Structures are given as structure tokens and as C-alpha cells.
């Protein structure tokens, strides 16, 4: 009756420092914390504003995926929170390098403000494969 | 060891307006995506302010859920975001015409600013049925 | 096939004052409704601000947890409000005499308000046991 929860960490995304994990994998959904454009060496948030961060956020994502044996493809739902909600059409072209079809679901809205002063942070929820449209 | 993944969409609701697909069905839990009240045929919000458009961002999950094989009943989850916290009133009043007993869990809060300056977006988590209540 | 849906109710945690649960428990997922410092007897928020309604939150949280069968080592991701992002540091400190190893997947962020002038709301969701790493 019990199931695995494993704490994903890898040193290629920046590490938490924190009461937090990068991510919480738990019967095959993978929950990812809001990743922002921080530098996993520097530790700082990347120059340039919200088309640099967002690129480096989706980096950061990416990495926590591999390490939990998955990749872009794996994500069914996203959350994309913004330092100015007139940054999305940037945002979406960028977002569409790493999530190139069959986008997983969303909820985007402007927020008050971000970790560091940061433009974007990005969370989401996946799921380890193998996966299957057929109902079998 | 398969698990069903499937993307859900209808005409029934409007089409996304980015990249993303209206609801996701992984092995029985369907992750929506928020939604306001853009109006399907036209592509718009409709008019009339938070109550209006709460109204079309509920018709507009009513659709998406039908879609996945489900009603409001199946929703365990749902996100209110607000442009402003002082309609909560009005919004509840609404809400409660759609979700009507065993109700979701919630979060609620007010944001800066919500796409194409709507005064709402709701986002939630179904279940596909069948399902018993305790 | 069928899932059984529960509502987790606990006198133990504020009421809800909108038409939400608390908690809904389908199938071990439990979503948890954000809480906010109000104090379940009075059905308000404590005195003394962002410290202070922090531990009352997650308190609550507690409380709702218990009532389904958890405790804190069960919650896998939640979900930080803040009214103020400088109350980050404070909320932190509060957050880990609750949280202690194997932590949650975590997002926070400043919002622009939350309901009844809070200065804090934390939602979560966490996995009935038991779990294990093997």
C-alpha cells in the first residue's frame, strides 16, 4: 500500500537553499517548483531581462525533468507568473522552443512581484511515461 | 505500464490564444487550464464587466469538462484569480450557481493583471468518473 | 474503477466562509484550500500580522492534514501568497518549524491582495502514506 516520494535534485539546475526541493516525484507526477533565471553556478538571476530569464528558467526545468527521467514532452500543466503581463507574446515564443506541441495546460497571470526581482517564474506538473492516447 | 495522456479540446469553448491546450487527462485527473470569459464564436471577452465575465469563464469549463467526460461535480480543485478582491461577493454568487454541494478546495486571490484585461481567470483539477462520495 | 471523493471537514481549522472545502481527498491526492491566519473559534485573523498569520496558517493546515490521516511530511507541493515579498525571509523561518526533511516542491510570490486583508495565504497538496523512498 505505500508508494515511492523522491526528492528530484540535480546540480544542473541552481539547488534550493531552502525548506523546498527543485522537485517532488510521487506515483509517476513529478511536482516542479516555480523556477525563475537563475544561473545553477552564480546563483544569481541571469542578465537581461524577461527573454534571457524565461530561456534560462525553461533550462532549469528541463534539467529537473532529465533527472526524473523525462523531458518537456512529460508536462500536462504549467503556471506561468509575470513581472508585466505585456511580456507574453516574448514569453510564448520562447515558451514554444522547449514545448513545441501538445502544450500542456496553463494558467499566466501578472503577479506583484517575484523572487529577486525576477521578470518570470515558471512551475509545472509532470508525468513519468511510458504515456498512451489509446484507452487501451 | 502505460498511462493515458490525452489532450482535450472542443469548439465548444474558445481556442487558445498561445501556446497551450484547454485541458489535459492523465490517468484520470484533468488539468484545466485557467480560463476567462472569452466569449467562443467571437473570440472576445464579453461584455458587462466581473459577473459576465465569471458567468462565460464557468460556461466556458462547463464545455472543456463535458469534453473530458465530466461535470462540475468532478472538479476537486479550482484557482479564482481576481483584478480585484472586492468582487468576491459577486463572484461567489456566481460560482455557486455552477458548483452547487461537495465543493472543490479553493485558492483565491487577486492578481496584477490577467490576459487580454480580464477580470477573472479560473483554472482547476477534475477528476474523470466514476466517483462516490463519502 | 470508481475513485471515492472526500471531503476532509475538521472543526479544528477555520470554516469556510465561500463556497469551498477545505480538503478533497480523491483516490491519495488531497488538495488543500489556502489557508490564511483566521483562527478557527473566532473565525478571524489573528492579531500581530505576517508572523503571526503565518504560523496560524500552516497551523490550520496542520489541523486539515491530521483530519485526513497526514502530517506535515505528507504535503509534496505548496504554494506561498504573500501580500509582501520582504515578509519572505519571516514566512521562512515560520515554514521550516513545520517542514523539516524531504521537502515540498515550493512556489512563491507577492500578489496584489488576499481575501480579508491577509497578509499571507498557503495552499498545498499532499499524498496519503504510506510513502516511502524503496
New interface residues.
Given amino acids: 500500500?505505500?508508494?515511492?516520494?523522491?526528492?528530484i535534485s540535480t546540480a544542473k539546475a541552481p539547488g534550493?537553499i531552502?525548506?523546498?526541493?527543485?522537485?517532488?516525484l510521487?506515483?509517476?507526477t513529478i511536482?516542479?517548483?516555480?523556477q525563475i533565471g537563475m544561473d545553477p553556478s552564480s546563483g544569481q538571476l541571469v542578465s537581461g531581462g524577461v527573454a534571457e530569464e524565461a530561456k534560462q528558467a525553461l533550462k532549469n526545468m528541463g534539467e529537473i525533468l532529465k533527472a526524473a527521467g523525462c523531458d518537456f514532452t512529460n508536462v500536462?500543466?504549467?503556471?506561468v507568473?509575470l513581472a508585466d503581463?505585456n511580456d507574453?507574446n516574448t514569453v510564448?515564443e520562447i515558451?514554444?522552443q522547449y514545448?513545441k506541441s501538445?502544450?500542456?495546460?496553463?494558467?499566466?497571470?501578472?503577479?506583484?512581484?517575484?523572487?529577486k526581482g525576477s521578470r518570470i517564474?515558471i512551475?509545472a506538473?509532470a508525468?513519468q511515461?511510458?504515456?498512451?492516447?489509446?484507452?487501451?
Wanted: charge should be positive; hydrophobic fraction near 45%.
Fill in positions: 500500500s505505500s508508494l515511492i516520494r523522491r526528492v534550493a531552502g525548506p523546498y526541493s527543485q522537485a517532488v510521487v506515483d509517476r511536482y516542479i517548483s516555480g500536462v500543466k504549467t503556471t507568473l503581463i507574453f510564448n515558451y514554444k514545448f501538445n502544450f500542456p495546460a496553463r494558467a499566466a497571470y501578472q503577479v506583484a512581484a517575484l523572487p517564474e512551475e506538473v508525468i511515461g511510458p504515456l498512451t492516447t489509446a484507452s487501451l
